[PDB]
Amino acid sequence: PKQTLDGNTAAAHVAYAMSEVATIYPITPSSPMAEIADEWAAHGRKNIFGKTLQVAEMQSEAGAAGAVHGSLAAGALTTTFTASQGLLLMIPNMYKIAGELLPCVFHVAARALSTHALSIFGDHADVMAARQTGFAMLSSASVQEVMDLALVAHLATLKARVPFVHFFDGFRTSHEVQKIDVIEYEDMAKLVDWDAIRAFRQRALNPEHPHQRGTAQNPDIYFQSREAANPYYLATPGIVAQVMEQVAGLTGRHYHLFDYAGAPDAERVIVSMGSSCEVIEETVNYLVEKGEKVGLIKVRLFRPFSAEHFLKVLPASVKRIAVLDRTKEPGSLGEPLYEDVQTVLAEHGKNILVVGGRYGLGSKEFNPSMVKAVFDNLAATTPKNKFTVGITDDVTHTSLEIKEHIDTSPKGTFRCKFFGLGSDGTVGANKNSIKIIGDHTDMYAQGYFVYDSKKSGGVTISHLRFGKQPIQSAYLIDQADLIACHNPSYVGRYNLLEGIK
Amino acid sequence: PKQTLDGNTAAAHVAYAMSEVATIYPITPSSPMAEIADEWAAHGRKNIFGKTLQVAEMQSEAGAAGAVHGSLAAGALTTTFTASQGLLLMIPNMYKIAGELLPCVFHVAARALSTHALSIFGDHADVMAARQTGFAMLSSASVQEVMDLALVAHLATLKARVPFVHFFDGFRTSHEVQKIDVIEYEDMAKLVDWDAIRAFRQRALNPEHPHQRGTAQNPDIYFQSREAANPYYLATPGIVAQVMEQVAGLTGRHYHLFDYAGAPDAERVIVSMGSSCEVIEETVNYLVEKGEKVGLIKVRLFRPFSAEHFLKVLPASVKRIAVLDRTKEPGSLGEPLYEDVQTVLAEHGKNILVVGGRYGLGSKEFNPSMVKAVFDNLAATTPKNKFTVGITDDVTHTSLEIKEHIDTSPKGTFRCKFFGLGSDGTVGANKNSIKIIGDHTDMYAQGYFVYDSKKSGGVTISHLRFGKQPIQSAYLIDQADLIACHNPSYVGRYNLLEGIKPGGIFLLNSTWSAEEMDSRLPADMKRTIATKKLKFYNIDAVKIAQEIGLGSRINVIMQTAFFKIANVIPVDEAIKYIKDSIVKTYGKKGDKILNMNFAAVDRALEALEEIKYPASWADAVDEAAATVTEEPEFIQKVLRPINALKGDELPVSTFTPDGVFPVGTTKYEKRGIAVNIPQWQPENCIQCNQCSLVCPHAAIRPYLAKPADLAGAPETFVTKDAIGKEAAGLKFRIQVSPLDCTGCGNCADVCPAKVKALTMVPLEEVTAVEEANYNFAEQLPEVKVNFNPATVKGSQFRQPLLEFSGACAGCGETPYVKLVTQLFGDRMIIANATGCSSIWGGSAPACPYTVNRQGHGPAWASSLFEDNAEFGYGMALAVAKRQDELATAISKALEAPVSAAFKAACEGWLAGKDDADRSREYGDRIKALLPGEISQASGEVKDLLLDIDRQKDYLTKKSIWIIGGDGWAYDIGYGGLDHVLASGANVNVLVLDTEVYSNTGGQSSKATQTGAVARFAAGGKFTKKKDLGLMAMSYGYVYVASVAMGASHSQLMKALIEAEKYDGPSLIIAYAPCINHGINMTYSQREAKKAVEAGYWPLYRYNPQLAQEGKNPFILDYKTPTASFRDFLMGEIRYTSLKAEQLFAKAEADAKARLEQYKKLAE
Amino acid sequence: SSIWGGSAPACPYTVNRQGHGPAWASSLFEDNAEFGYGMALAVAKRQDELATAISKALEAPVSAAFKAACEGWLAGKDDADRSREYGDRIKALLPGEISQASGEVKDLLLDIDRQKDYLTKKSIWIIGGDGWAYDIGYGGLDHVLASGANVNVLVLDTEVYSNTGGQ
């Protein structure tokens, strides 16, 4: 059926169905996943095993991670929800869970790490800090993809024995409300490898068929023992690809380890990950229709990085590539996705100019005008490398100049902004309006809400979209058809009518 | 000056001079840094600020990292030392320390991360997991570079405001002893940027010029604020380069961000990091001299990666590059350094074929032959990418072929190997020999020491090198000029003479004469001695030590024999240096002990005998090997080759992909290391089985048998009539396992008979007899007996499911765990924290946990040091879920057309699934009816029965046991332990309280008492012992008990059964005597008796069930002590070394206040 | 307490007329006790560096009134009231004492003036909620209390996770 959900609920919907245990510890913006899963169990929702999910809160995410390890090693399918500093505390146990080849899915609302300052907002800094744990990493770019790819990760991890991090952009996707196609629990159970679940049960710690795990090893066998898991990692791309085809036959939506969008003869291509892919594809449609030879490669399966599947969707006409990383590794030669793209192209002798940049740190806005600036830099005689987009770097001069303002929203999309007062009911009403419009029309409906740190009396700005076409606008509203001001004090204080058509 | 140090001491030397505060938490192999820094402070060593360094131990590396952050923000220069899992826990604060641009140096002895298995050994996995924190990363390749680059990091971080990780290869460099140039503290202070220090003080948190840091930021400014630190990272390469110029002018040793070595016109170049650079450069010199155009780029500054400094040292003729990473990122396109090199070369349009490989994981050997294999792969038509070196990967075929063996050791380098026994003095003497040679000659000196997993009686192999040229050989010795065997038992057991050069020296310690050599030495050893024309020397060092009065200590004797034949220095000079070291080691022992060691030197010179062997030894032929017994595949293919020191030859296809091991494999070891074993006196035995209870290795057990079963018994298998109404008509015998006994002597001390029924006799005299006795007792059939398991005697007739572990002789920990398996081992799951209990409980490839005749036994798992409570908590959730799935299928069977007896057993199980006895009774009934019930069913009903059979291993209720040491329970895992106890889950926590960190050598813990001396508490611990039991009692619904087996057997039995039957969280704090206490391990049980009698250790039981019955939950099991508290402290070295009087008085006052408080809770 | 206490760009902690007021820092959720513990060690180190320079001033040709305030401060550096009393006396005598000095004595007085912000004994306050003290940071809080350090821990017990909505 069609329902209006946010990313967190879409992920919890699938995680609840596919798991028996959930050991959790709350952290924004991932805790709504654990909260709504706790409510469903209290209301008696059954998973595909006919029972309610058991939610156990620990003293920290470190305690949660250790509990996952013990629950998995003893024979219970276990999931968890975390982000940012919480994901960091789980990293030590992630090495164990991957090392022991235990099926598992971590659902992460990717959030910035505390550096010069704390930030509750979204980027991939937390996920990138765990890219060496041996977990597989699957990125979903929209609420619909959170629904679909959460199922992919849960199905794939059972087959591959490699645990998965399924991550989606914090707030920008985790709190974005969208009308999506919801996959029935009965249909999930029809795709599960039940043989793989039973084999997982046979390996469990049990005194009636005992074993020892987690030994300490000398230099004589440790290296060999670490390489003994290579076949499982070599097989994980093909397993994910086949699981994606199962979902394709069920839903009609075709995912690949790497997806391509844009001109078949594109010469400038952006490689990106997460919700930025939505913004870029919307911009690419606008530019391709204008005659520009541009394209986009969406990274779904970040780890294991399959060179075969990346090159499979890279058009032969590509001469210049801009890679966008939603993270910062200070002092590094480049950010992770940029170094992956640079490496794979060198390993295959491709003469392609590759350039890397950073964007969207701490939920920094990333809109189509920034996407064109990235494309414009690829068209320059000397493209700027190691750049930034969305800020003005007047110290080290890394930022790209936003030359012109473009409006790439598909025509026929209604756009509304609502300026509200803290806890005056505006956000709640707009959510109900999205549900009303989504449930009773054929239109896609989208909602995103800008909050303040103050619990009472802050400014809230709701961004709502409705259209006959899928809404890929993972950015704030540019040209509003309707603007509502629910507080007379704002008149003369804020630029309410800014950008109204 | 020149001193012989290891990497850890070299690093601590600079860190101590440059720092005011050091907040630490111990972890191998980085903890020696914090230990020696604590010792220097204890003796008043001054840093460059004229003060002693303040060393503070935290509860974990997370607590250490937070303390570093706070100390830095408040204006103190602060350092720390860590590695591996410790570095992981510091990563969250590393983001903050870098984000706030605080000068700092983390010194890391790089160690592998715990994945499919724990590994204390060296690779870059830990450092690579932090490469995105914003710390700078500086790599040291040798002990000399640890000294130099530690200074570079401390100097550069003040100027750059970017904190540094200065890391060096764990063990391979941190524990490698080398003679190096040591930088004077006064010279360090002349290079320090004192303006940069003062500016750091001005930025400090201070109420007279306050500021705010660590704010929370919205999306509007967070990105810009994060990029504002770019100038500091852009400037760090130039700053590090300039500091390297300061150190160069002071020392003459020139470092660069990237250094090049090899042919100026090289076409094949290796890019690498750490001690591998030493091995590669030595190989490059050898190959370049032979005409090959090869080179090497050493990565010093890994972060920030400066493209300008990398390309400047890359020769223009390079066509092919192999990048070597000492880490593995599974599923990654490539490892980190390979991706950096590939990226930078692409950014500058270099047409260079780049290939990446992995090496040296977990201290895997990386020698010149492997280096050439990497160079040969660059010379192939199609170089293999994503390769491995040092292993045979027959599954995924990533390993490079080691074609030929090369010797790249510089000519004139002397090479020696010493095969020693655990704690026989060999390693200590070799360290002293390196100090002697380094201090008194112009030669470079190098030492590396290979240790064993066995704590007592293990094999040690020392690797020593001396030469006129710098020693870059960061690998084991291949061709030895001299080989010494300090244990004659190794003759015929290990390949001692492997790779010895023709005409080399073989020194042997044995009582065998030249004529007995023909019969005692194996044929292969005689062949090597003759063909290579070795100088064979022998010495009866034990005879010398006996006659002088030194007992069996041969360390001084064997060291004297080495210098006598090695021809490394003048023999007369060596004798003086040895006696000078004897004065330094035995000067405080007394005048009598001194002259005995002087006599050891003198007599050792005259007793060394050259063995004139016949030339016909070269033609000797191996004797026909006996018909070997058919052993299981794992024992034959895995365990034997590993114990034969051949585990490196095992290919990848040998191992499971997830680190899963079988149980019950220690019974194949049969080490036979005991000097004395208990001999049973049948006439004095009262059949009490207390000897079986206290044995730390389950080497002595009682055996019952019907008289018919004693048919094929040897004549020496003397038995006695069985005492007790349960064993009427049976025979009784106390039998010892001679090859598994350790000779500790606890069983003879516990034997309560009038005349001792167990007497210690030498093993060799009775070994042939008792082996036949044990082999018959072990094959005896099972005897159904109705002895009460709640008694000491009745529990010991149950089979021990923990046997023959690697714990020390007389260990105070294993008897507790052994007893738990005898009570509930049939149905228990163990979550074991890192520590001693995980080392003797789970060191590959042998598992001391075993199964009974039905194949049932404890399932064992170890996760981390910090997560053990939550680890077992997760197990409890899963087991409950699996029992729920089983219960659902059984309830469906009630609606199915099945036999009435099946429904009767199903209803009985459903009503008692949560009771241990009832779930087994009705569970076993269902198992007996299942094969016949399935045969009589068909269709969907047959499937319903097949689903019950699929889950029949959850009918019996399980017993979750969370086992760990006091360091886990009181410190790093206390927060998790507190939460699991508060949760109310039905888990049983067993804390083996040794009051120290026993595994890592004896560091301080919160369980350490007042006045006790341990590492990080050199002057004695001032604060009293934290009362873990008292805090757990505050919840009220937690079963808490304090036990001590040596003090009261019945109190231990009572608390264990009460804790396990309690439907809730249970905490057992067990007093575990340890070798670190400084006591005679023969009387380990007796020391626990004096502990309770002196008020040092309490015995109580807190039962929440008594509160619901209207009774007092707290029961004080020992109210009035009869022994002196001050006298118990005098019986352990850990308290006598303080003599100081103020701490003894404080310890007694705390014991009286704790005892009086327990009287208040009971009254 | 960190959201209303330290959300950029506004800081609610302020200074008095002399410009003195609480210095505020937030590290992580789990490390706050050990965080403040490290601050306590550092401040003690900074007072020791100042106290060493003041003892050298007793051995220097400086005014008798300057030596009297130094002896009073050295005797009361660990008391809040006494360290402020003699500390402010040193601050009042420093500009005139530096004016009458030269050479190494002038450098020694300038070194006192460089560290005069540690004359008054500091008061370390470790502030956090019940979620920090009872759960994620309890192990660190337990250790810092057991250490015996002179720190002041303030647990704002709301009996819930107030910031994150009430968990």
Ligand SMILES: Cc1ncc(C[n+]2csc(CCOP(=O)(O)OP(=O)(O)O)c2C)c(N)n1
């Ligand atoms: C996070 C982490 N820090 C440090 C270590 C190193 N380490 C393992 S066990 C141990 C001490 C064990 O002490 P205890 O818990 O008392 O067990 P015991 O050896 O005394 O029986 C240490 C320091 C580690 N494995 N992980």
Ligand SMILES: Cc1ncc(C[n+]2csc(CCOP(=O)(O)OP(=O)(O)O)c2C)c(N)n1
């Ligand atoms: C490692 C980590 N885990 C979780 C979080 C999310 N988080 C921050 S504060 C907080 C709860 C605050 O509770 P409390 O300590 O009682 O303070 P209060 O807001 O109620 O005053 C949580 C769950 C985090 N920032 N870091």
Ligand code: SF4
């Ligand atoms: S001497 Fe020690 S190891 Fe040997 S049987 Fe007796 S208690 Fe066991």
Ligand code: SF4
């Ligand atoms: S302790 Fe002595 S009396 Fe008791 S069973 Fe053992 S040998 Fe017999």
Ligand code: SF4
């Ligand atoms: S606890 Fe002590 S006696 Fe037991 S194995 Fe460890 S070091 Fe040896």
Ligand SMILES: [Mg+2]
């Ligand atoms: Mg201990």
Ligand SMILES: [Mg+2]
């Ligand atoms: Mg609170």
